[PDB]
Write a protein that binds this ligand. Structure first.
Ligand code: RFT
Ligand code: RFT
Ligand code: RFT
Ligand code: RFT
Ligand code: CA
Ligand code: CA
Ligand code: CA
Ligand code: CA
Ligand code: CA
Ligand code: CA
Ligand code: CA
Ligand code: CA
Ligand code: CA
Ligand code: CA
Ligand code: CA
Ligand code: CA
Ligand code: CA
Ligand code: CA
Ligand code: CA
Ligand code: CA
Ligand code: CA
Ligand code: CA
Ligand code: CA
Ligand code: CA
Ligand code: CA
Ligand code: CA
Ligand code: CA
Ligand code: CA
Ligand code: CA
Ligand code: CA
Ligand code: CA
Ligand code: CA
Ligand code: CA
Ligand code: CA
Ligand code: CA
Ligand code: CA
Ligand code: CA
Ligand code: CA
Ligand code: CA
Ligand code: FE
Ligand code: FE
Ligand code: FE
Ligand code: FE
Ligand code: FE
Ligand code: FE
Ligand code: FE
Ligand code: FE
Ligand code: NA
Ligand code: NA
Ligand code: NA
Ligand code: NA
Lengths: 172, 172, 172, 172
């Protein structure tokens, strides 16, 4: 057993390894979305920048979970990072909708992790999740919902003028 | 023979003279496009500025080829600069499409020049073209494609509001 | 066909997609190595920092290839990022040796890509690889070789004092 | 009853008084360790500084618990601060091992306090412990584990050169 390990259940250690993979996956999804908007036949540079920023932030979140695993004396076991479920993200609105869905899935996983930590009486882990993950997730979901609403209200995706102006005025 | 000339084939010298003319031609096409957008019945000032900038950049590219010809001990032979194929460029979208076509033609010529340099085992000339021309061309073609995509998606040329807003938000 | 595509062979497009995956893989290997050195039973913070920096640099290299694919009018097709071949990297020396092996594999792939570009008379792609990848690779391989030499000469891995002092004085 | 007291169980008040004593004890242990390293026949000045800093930090932690007791309307009851279990700490490695053991004992006490707060439905107390104590403890335990690992790997305590160089390069 690691000399630092204390009050850290095997199930929690495994769940942290799963969460590391999920954050790396989210990073990859956002990377894919970013470069879709960089295509010459899409060409929405601020959508591209927005999703690239999200990509980098998710990588930072994964690295913080890796640090946590080592802090608690668990052992990191990495898994393949699955490629995303689309190659072509169709439109600004469709990508924002897919990001909203992704973030709600990540939140669900984090809520299950918090429940596990609480069930195993691991308040350090529970607080780590609350402090560094849960409000970030709520903020991200709210922002994506706001973006979806505006794009729909503006007439996307059928109005290409809508996506163009949203790219300039909200994401720029 | 020039005291500096070394490993510089007559065919390469001739091809550089042709490329000088083609860059000067491109400069003239962009000059024409610029002042079309300055007409009182067109009046898109940022289209005008964008194409004037491209005009000046093409002139700089021609001057760099003239410098190259002298650096290698070739002799510059200038030719007439043909007037462009249109007087009236019709719309912002149509001008961007014509610029895309022009840039792909210039790129084709540069690729043939590179092939000639390679065939004549002239690595200085090949590298000059790669370093100062080929990625600039790829970037210019990508940018023009991006512009064409956005104008089409926004509803140009039939939507005059589209060209107006593109002039303000992308070219401004 | 993409409106920007010119002189860009289908085989080159596919090879760029493979190279994107390989750079993302390398990023993941370095991420794994970094956090191995962050374990409480390893605890070499400058090894950890060195490999994290390499991880981030490889991600940047992958993103530049994605940009290239779009610049040329190819289409990005992402693939799974395979997990690394080890979970436990054993020692500072062993990790440096594995990084050297990885970098030589990436270089081999880049050299094959350059050969393909040359065979398809794609000087833009050949120059992109030369300018942004080939000397970076030679520098990285030389640095890793230097590190391996010093660790071996100092008595690693059996001398834990050697790895400690290398962490402080070379990587710090 | 104190005019401020609300939702503050007698058992929680008593547990806070015990925790105040334990933090003061930890401060005293670190004070002892610090001045052991200041002996002329030990003479490791950065070990001495490291443990003196920990001593002062533990005192600050005790004072914050005293403030908490008063904030909640409990009453501070101080107890003797027991002298440490050693006078002679033997070596840098042995002191680091004893500090690791101490910090895990303090963490265990804090985890029991959190469980008590949760069992008495005192979320203010639970959050106070999580926010100001639990991650600090995890960080301290991880750091001490890292130090123990490095000293052992370097050949301490039998290698006096190891302790000397660790004092200079890690603690300096
Ligand atoms: C969706 O809600 N359609 C109803 C009309 N509407 C709103 O109420 C918000 C923006 C918008 O377009
Ligand atoms: C041209 O592609 N028309 C389809 C709809 N659409 C897009 O997919 C991009 C912008 C736009 O208007
Ligand atoms: C490996 O080459 N062993 C021979 C001795 N030696 C050198 O020549 C370089 C560093 C070192 O230890
Ligand atoms: C203790 O683990 N001894 C094995 C050799 N070794 C390591 O693996 C880490 C540092 C060191 O000396
Ligand atoms: Ca445990
Ligand atoms: Ca367990
Ligand atoms: Ca596990
Ligand atoms: Ca997994
Ligand atoms: Ca798969
Ligand atoms: Ca699929
Ligand atoms: Ca599918
Ligand atoms: Ca499908
Ligand atoms: Ca909390
Ligand atoms: Ca000659
Ligand atoms: Ca000749
Ligand atoms: Ca000639
Ligand atoms: Ca001519
Ligand atoms: Ca004529
Ligand atoms: Ca004519
Ligand atoms: Ca005509
Ligand atoms: Ca005509
Ligand atoms: Ca082609
Ligand atoms: Ca082809
Ligand atoms: Ca392909
Ligand atoms: Ca692949
Ligand atoms: Ca696999
Ligand atoms: Ca394997
Ligand atoms: Ca294996
Ligand atoms: Ca094996
Ligand atoms: Ca070159
Ligand atoms: Ca030294
Ligand atoms: Ca009360
Ligand atoms: Ca009570
Ligand atoms: Ca009491
Ligand atoms: Ca007591
Ligand atoms: Ca006593
Ligand atoms: Ca005693
Ligand atoms: Ca005793
Ligand atoms: Ca004794
Ligand atoms: Fe996340
Ligand atoms: Fe997220
Ligand atoms: Fe040009
Ligand atoms: Fe040009
Ligand atoms: Fe690389
Ligand atoms: Fe590399
Ligand atoms: Fe404490
Ligand atoms: Fe402490
Ligand atoms: Na943005
Ligand atoms: Na402009
Ligand atoms: Na370093
Ligand atoms: Na110190």
């Amino acid at each position: 057993t690691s000399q630092v390990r204390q009050n850290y259940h095997q199930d929690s250690e495994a769940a942290i390894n799963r969460q590391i993979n999920l954050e790396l996956y989210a990073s990859y999804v956002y990377l894919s979305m970013s470069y879709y908007f960089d295509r010459d036949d899409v060409a929405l540079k601020n959508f591209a920048k927005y999703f690239l920023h999200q990509s980098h932030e998710e990588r930072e979140h994964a690295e913080k979970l890796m640090k946590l695993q080592n802090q608690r004396g668990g052992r990191i076991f990495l898994q393949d990072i699955q490629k995303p479920d689309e190659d072509d993200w169709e439109s600004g609105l469709n990508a924002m909708e897919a990001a909203l869905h992704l973030e709600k899935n990540v939140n669900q996983s984090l809520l299950e992790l918090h429940k596990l930590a609480t069930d195993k009486n691991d308040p350090h882990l529970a607080d780590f999740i609350e402090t560094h993950y849960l409000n970030e997730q709520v903020k991200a979901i709210k922002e994506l919902g706001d973006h979806v609403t505006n794009l729909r209200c503006m007439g996307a995706p059928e109005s290409g003028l809508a996506e163009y102006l949203f790219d300039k005025h909200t994401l720029g």
